[PDB]
Amino acid sequence: SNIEQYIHDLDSNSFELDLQFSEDEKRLLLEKQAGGNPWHQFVENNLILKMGPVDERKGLFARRRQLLLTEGPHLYYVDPVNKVLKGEIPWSQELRPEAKNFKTFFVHTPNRTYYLMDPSGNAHKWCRKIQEVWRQRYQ
């Protein structure tokens, strides 16, 4: 199955998937997630395509999230300390990621632009992956 061929784990909490797997491979990837991923409970049984820590600039100080791009598509954000789903960035054809620098990226949606910061310096990886999924979904 060599299913690991599609998984690129940086560490416990950051990975992304190559999106060129078959339906049988998808189901195997999902069983692996349910069996092994501590954030699976937050994503409504959707296969996680990319996850990792991101800070949202909101209110009086940045909120550290675990951000999860999934099948759906969905972008869920979870409190990584108290282990509670905090919300989702709403997905539509109008959703648009935009890199501002190596650490900062925005996710534009009709009623709100989410201002996000990747402390690892890989905001572009987030934009690229969100765009890849957007392209697959919207042509």
Side-chain angles (χ1 to χ4, degrees), residues 1-19 21-138:
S1 79
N2 272 17
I3 211 84
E4 293 288 342
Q5 62 182 302
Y6 305 112
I7 303 179
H8 300 298
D9 290 300
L10 177 63
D11 61 26
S12 293
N13 309 302
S14 290
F15 73 84
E16 45 181 77
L17 293 190
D18 293 333
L19 301 183
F21 42 79
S22 80
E23 180 64 18
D24 290 316
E25 297 171 321
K26 158 148 174 232
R27 301 186 178 206
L28 283 164
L29 286 160
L30 193 60
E31 141 188 316
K32 176 181 192 308
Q33 177 179 304
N37 192 319
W39 311 95
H40 177 91
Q41 51 165 317
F42 302 114
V43 302
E44 306 179 299
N45 201 38
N46 288 310
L47 184 71
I48 296 159
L49 311 181
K50 176 170 178 69
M51 70 178 196
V54 173
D55 288 338
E56 187 180 351
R57 177 174 198 116
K58 78 178 292 199
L60 304 183
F61 56 83
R63 321 257 202 265
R64 176 58 68 80
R65 313 295 198 190
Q66 180 77 349
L67 186 66
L68 303 114
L69 173 59
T70 76
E71 167 190 11
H74 295 277
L75 274 163
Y76 306 96
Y77 51 95
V78 177
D79 178 347
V81 184
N82 302 298
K83 311 304 203 297
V84 172
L85 179 70
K86 284 305 209 200
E88 282 182 58
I89 302 172
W91 193 279
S92 74
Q93 186 157 354
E94 289 77 51
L95 177 148
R96 175 176 83 95
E98 179 194 7
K100 303 298 266 181
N101 58 53
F102 79 120
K103 287 179 127 103
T104 296
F105 67 111
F106 294 4
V107 187
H108 306 294
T109 70
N111 303 319
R112 178 160 304 159
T113 287
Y114 293 77
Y115 312 118
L116 306 175
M117 201 274 315
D118 175 3
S120 82
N122 291 280
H124 288 247
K125 292 185 61 128
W126 272 105
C127 298
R128 276 204 2 259
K129 206 76 196 194
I130 292 167
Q131 201 52 31
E132 187 178 3
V133 172
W134 185 104
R135 275 186 239 105
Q136 284 199 29
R137 173 61 180 80
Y138 302 113

Short mmCIF file of all heavy atoms in Angstrom, two decimals, residues 21-52:
data_model
loop_
_atom_site.label_atom_id
_atom_site.label_comp_id
_atom_site.label_asym_id
_atom_site.label_seq_id
_atom_site.Cartn_x
_atom_site.Cartn_y
_atom_site.Cartn_z
N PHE A 21 -3.92 10.43 -4.08
CA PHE A 21 -4.24 9.07 -3.68
C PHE A 21 -5.60 8.63 -4.20
O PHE A 21 -6.46 9.45 -4.53
CB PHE A 21 -4.19 8.93 -2.17
CG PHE A 21 -4.82 10.08 -1.44
CD1 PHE A 21 -6.20 10.18 -1.30
CD2 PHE A 21 -4.04 11.05 -0.87
CE1 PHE A 21 -6.78 11.24 -0.62
CE2 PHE A 21 -4.61 12.10 -0.19
CZ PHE A 21 -5.97 12.18 -0.03
N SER A 22 -5.76 7.31 -4.31
CA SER A 22 -6.99 6.65 -4.73
C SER A 22 -8.01 6.64 -3.61
O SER A 22 -7.70 6.95 -2.46
CB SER A 22 -6.68 5.22 -5.15
OG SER A 22 -6.56 4.36 -4.03
N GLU A 23 -9.25 6.28 -3.94
CA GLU A 23 -10.27 6.18 -2.93
C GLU A 23 -9.94 5.12 -1.86
O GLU A 23 -10.17 5.35 -0.68
CB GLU A 23 -11.66 5.98 -3.59
CG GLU A 23 -12.80 5.85 -2.64
CD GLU A 23 -13.06 7.09 -1.80
OE1 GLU A 23 -12.56 8.17 -2.17
OE2 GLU A 23 -13.76 6.95 -0.76
N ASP A 24 -9.42 3.95 -2.25
CA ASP A 24 -9.03 2.92 -1.28
C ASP A 24 -7.92 3.46 -0.36
O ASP A 24 -7.93 3.20 0.85
CB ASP A 24 -8.45 1.67 -1.94
CG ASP A 24 -9.47 0.86 -2.69
OD1 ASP A 24 -10.57 0.66 -2.15
OD2 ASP A 24 -9.22 0.34 -3.80
N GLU A 25 -6.99 4.21 -0.93
CA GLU A 25 -5.92 4.82 -0.16
C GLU A 25 -6.46 5.88 0.79
O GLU A 25 -6.01 5.94 1.93
CB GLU A 25 -4.84 5.40 -1.07
CG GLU A 25 -4.18 4.30 -1.90
CD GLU A 25 -3.25 4.81 -2.99
OE1 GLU A 25 -3.54 5.83 -3.65
OE2 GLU A 25 -2.21 4.16 -3.18
N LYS A 26 -7.41 6.67 0.36
CA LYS A 26 -8.07 7.64 1.23
C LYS A 26 -8.65 6.98 2.48
O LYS A 26 -8.47 7.45 3.61
CB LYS A 26 -9.18 8.41 0.52
CG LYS A 26 -10.20 8.99 1.54
CD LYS A 26 -10.78 10.23 1.12
CE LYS A 26 -11.90 10.62 2.17
NZ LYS A 26 -13.15 10.90 1.45
N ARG A 27 -9.36 5.87 2.29
CA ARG A 27 -9.98 5.20 3.43
C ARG A 27 -8.92 4.67 4.41
O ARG A 27 -9.13 4.70 5.62
CB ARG A 27 -10.91 4.11 2.94
CG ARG A 27 -12.01 4.72 2.02
CD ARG A 27 -13.08 3.79 1.56
NE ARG A 27 -14.08 4.47 0.74
CZ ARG A 27 -15.35 4.06 0.61
NH1 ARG A 27 -15.75 2.95 1.25
NH2 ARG A 27 -16.21 4.75 -0.16
N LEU A 28 -7.79 4.20 3.87
CA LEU A 28 -6.68 3.75 4.69
C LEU A 28 -6.03 4.90 5.44
O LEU A 28 -5.65 4.74 6.59
CB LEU A 28 -5.62 3.06 3.87
CG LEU A 28 -6.06 1.63 3.49
CD1 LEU A 28 -5.20 1.11 2.38
CD2 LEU A 28 -6.00 0.70 4.74
N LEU A 29 -5.87 6.03 4.76
CA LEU A 29 -5.36 7.25 5.40
C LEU A 29 -6.27 7.72 6.52
O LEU A 29 -5.81 8.16 7.56
CB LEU A 29 -5.18 8.33 4.35
CG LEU A 29 -3.98 8.18 3.39
CD1 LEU A 29 -4.20 8.99 2.16
CD2 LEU A 29 -2.65 8.58 4.05
N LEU A 30 -7.59 7.58 6.33
CA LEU A 30 -8.56 7.97 7.33
C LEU A 30 -8.51 7.04 8.53
O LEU A 30 -8.66 7.51 9.64
CB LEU A 30 -9.99 8.06 6.77
CG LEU A 30 -11.02 8.75 7.65
CD1 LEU A 30 -10.68 10.19 7.97
CD2 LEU A 30 -12.41 8.66 6.98
N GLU A 31 -8.32 5.74 8.31
CA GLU A 31 -8.29 4.80 9.43
C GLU A 31 -7.05 5.08 10.22
O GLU A 31 -7.14 5.09 11.46
CB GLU A 31 -8.33 3.34 8.90
CG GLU A 31 -7.47 2.28 9.58
CD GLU A 31 -7.49 0.96 8.82
OE1 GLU A 31 -8.60 0.55 8.41
OE2 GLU A 31 -6.40 0.36 8.60
N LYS A 32 -5.95 5.40 9.54
CA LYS A 32 -4.70 5.78 10.21
C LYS A 32 -4.91 7.02 11.10
O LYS A 32 -4.47 7.04 12.25
CB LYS A 32 -3.57 6.00 9.17
CG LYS A 32 -2.29 6.48 9.71
CD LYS A 32 -1.24 6.68 8.57
CE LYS A 32 0.15 6.88 9.16
NZ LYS A 32 0.17 7.96 10.19
N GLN A 33 -5.61 8.01 10.60
CA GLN A 33 -5.90 9.25 11.33
C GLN A 33 -6.74 8.96 12.58
O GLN A 33 -6.44 9.46 13.65
CB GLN A 33 -6.68 10.20 10.44
CG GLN A 33 -7.11 11.50 11.05
CD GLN A 33 -7.86 12.37 10.03
OE1 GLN A 33 -7.33 12.67 8.94
NE2 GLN A 33 -9.08 12.76 10.38
N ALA A 34 -7.80 8.17 12.42
CA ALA A 34 -8.71 7.91 13.52
C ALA A 34 -7.95 7.16 14.59
O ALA A 34 -8.21 7.33 15.77
CB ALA A 34 -9.95 7.11 13.06
N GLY A 35 -7.03 6.30 14.16
CA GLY A 35 -6.28 5.44 15.06
C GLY A 35 -5.14 6.15 15.77
O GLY A 35 -4.67 5.71 16.82
N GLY A 36 -4.73 7.29 15.22
CA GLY A 36 -3.47 7.87 15.56
C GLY A 36 -3.37 9.36 15.76
O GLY A 36 -2.44 9.77 16.40
N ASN A 37 -4.29 10.17 15.22
CA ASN A 37 -4.20 11.62 15.24
C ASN A 37 -5.02 12.21 16.40
O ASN A 37 -6.21 12.05 16.43
CB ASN A 37 -4.72 12.16 13.89
CG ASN A 37 -4.42 13.64 13.67
OD1 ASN A 37 -4.53 14.46 14.58
ND2 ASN A 37 -4.01 13.98 12.48
N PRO A 38 -4.38 12.89 17.34
CA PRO A 38 -5.08 13.46 18.52
C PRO A 38 -6.11 14.58 18.22
O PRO A 38 -6.91 14.90 19.06
CB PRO A 38 -3.91 13.99 19.38
CG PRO A 38 -2.83 14.28 18.41
CD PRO A 38 -2.93 13.12 17.41
N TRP A 39 -6.12 15.11 17.00
CA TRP A 39 -7.05 16.13 16.58
C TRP A 39 -8.24 15.57 15.78
O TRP A 39 -9.14 16.30 15.43
CB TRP A 39 -6.31 17.15 15.71
CG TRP A 39 -5.03 17.64 16.33
CD1 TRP A 39 -3.79 17.16 16.12
CD2 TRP A 39 -4.90 18.62 17.38
NE1 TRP A 39 -2.86 17.81 16.90
CE2 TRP A 39 -3.52 18.71 17.70
CE3 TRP A 39 -5.80 19.42 18.06
CZ2 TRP A 39 -3.02 19.59 18.65
CZ3 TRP A 39 -5.29 20.30 19.03
CH2 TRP A 39 -3.92 20.36 19.30
N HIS A 40 -8.23 14.27 15.48
CA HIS A 40 -9.32 13.69 14.72
C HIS A 40 -10.71 13.99 15.29
O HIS A 40 -11.68 14.17 14.53
CB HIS A 40 -9.11 12.18 14.61
CG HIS A 40 -10.21 11.45 13.91
ND1 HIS A 40 -10.21 11.22 12.56
CD2 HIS A 40 -11.35 10.90 14.38
CE1 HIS A 40 -11.26 10.50 12.23
NE2 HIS A 40 -11.99 10.31 13.32
N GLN A 41 -10.82 14.05 16.61
CA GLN A 41 -12.11 14.30 17.23
C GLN A 41 -12.74 15.65 16.84
O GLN A 41 -13.94 15.81 16.97
CB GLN A 41 -12.02 14.18 18.76
CG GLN A 41 -10.88 14.99 19.34
CD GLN A 41 -10.98 15.18 20.86
OE1 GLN A 41 -12.06 15.44 21.39
NE2 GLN A 41 -9.83 15.07 21.54
N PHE A 42 -11.94 16.58 16.33
CA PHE A 42 -12.40 17.95 16.06
C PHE A 42 -12.85 18.20 14.61
O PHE A 42 -13.40 19.24 14.33
CB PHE A 42 -11.26 18.93 16.38
CG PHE A 42 -10.81 18.82 17.80
CD1 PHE A 42 -9.51 18.37 18.10
CD2 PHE A 42 -11.69 19.08 18.84
CE1 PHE A 42 -9.10 18.22 19.44
CE2 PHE A 42 -11.25 18.97 20.18
CZ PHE A 42 -9.97 18.52 20.45
N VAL A 43 -12.60 17.24 13.72
CA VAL A 43 -12.77 17.47 12.28
C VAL A 43 -13.91 16.71 11.59
O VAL A 43 -13.89 16.50 10.38
CB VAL A 43 -11.44 17.24 11.54
CG1 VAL A 43 -10.37 18.17 12.11
CG2 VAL A 43 -10.95 15.80 11.60
N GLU A 44 -14.88 16.26 12.38
CA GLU A 44 -16.11 15.63 11.85
C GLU A 44 -15.85 14.48 10.86
O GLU A 44 -16.55 14.35 9.86
CB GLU A 44 -17.00 16.69 11.20
CG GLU A 44 -17.31 17.85 12.12
CD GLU A 44 -18.15 18.91 11.47
OE1 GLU A 44 -17.76 19.54 10.45
OE2 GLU A 44 -19.25 19.11 12.01
N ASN A 45 -14.87 13.65 11.21
CA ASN A 45 -14.45 12.46 10.45
C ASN A 45 -13.91 12.77 9.05
O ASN A 45 -13.87 11.90 8.18
CB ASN A 45 -15.56 11.41 10.36
CG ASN A 45 -15.01 10.03 10.04
OD1 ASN A 45 -13.94 9.64 10.53
ND2 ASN A 45 -15.73 9.29 9.20
N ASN A 46 -13.54 14.04 8.83
CA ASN A 46 -12.94 14.46 7.56
C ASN A 46 -11.46 14.15 7.58
O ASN A 46 -10.79 14.32 8.60
CB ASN A 46 -13.19 15.95 7.33
CG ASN A 46 -14.62 16.21 6.99
OD1 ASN A 46 -15.17 15.54 6.10
ND2 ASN A 46 -15.24 17.18 7.65
N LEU A 47 -10.93 13.75 6.43
CA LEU A 47 -9.51 13.46 6.32
C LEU A 47 -8.73 14.76 6.38
O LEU A 47 -9.00 15.66 5.59
CB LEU A 47 -9.21 12.75 5.00
CG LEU A 47 -7.74 12.30 4.84
CD1 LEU A 47 -7.33 11.14 5.74
CD2 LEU A 47 -7.50 11.95 3.40
N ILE A 48 -7.76 14.83 7.28
CA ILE A 48 -6.91 15.99 7.45
C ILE A 48 -5.85 16.00 6.37
O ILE A 48 -5.09 15.03 6.20
CB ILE A 48 -6.27 16.00 8.86
CG1 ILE A 48 -7.34 16.14 9.94
CG2 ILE A 48 -5.25 17.17 8.98
CD1 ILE A 48 -6.89 15.63 11.36
N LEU A 49 -5.83 17.10 5.62
CA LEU A 49 -4.89 17.30 4.51
C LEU A 49 -3.64 18.05 4.90
O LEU A 49 -2.56 17.81 4.33
CB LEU A 49 -5.59 18.01 3.37
CG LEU A 49 -6.95 17.37 3.02
CD1 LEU A 49 -7.61 18.07 1.88
CD2 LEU A 49 -6.78 15.85 2.71
N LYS A 50 -3.78 18.99 5.81
CA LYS A 50 -2.63 19.69 6.40
C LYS A 50 -3.05 20.17 7.77
O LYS A 50 -4.17 20.61 7.97
CB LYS A 50 -2.20 20.88 5.52
CG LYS A 50 -1.04 21.76 6.10
CD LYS A 50 -0.52 22.76 5.03
CE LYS A 50 0.55 23.64 5.57
NZ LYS A 50 1.80 22.84 5.83
N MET A 51 -2.17 20.09 8.74
CA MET A 51 -2.41 20.70 10.03
C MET A 51 -1.11 21.22 10.59
O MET A 51 -0.05 20.71 10.27
CB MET A 51 -3.03 19.68 11.03
CG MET A 51 -2.11 18.58 11.50
SD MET A 51 -2.95 17.54 12.68
CE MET A 51 -1.58 16.70 13.39
N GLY A 52 -1.25 22.20 11.48
CA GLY A 52 -0.14 22.66 12.27
C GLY A 52 -0.49 23.90 13.02
O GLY A 52 -1.58 24.39 12.88
#
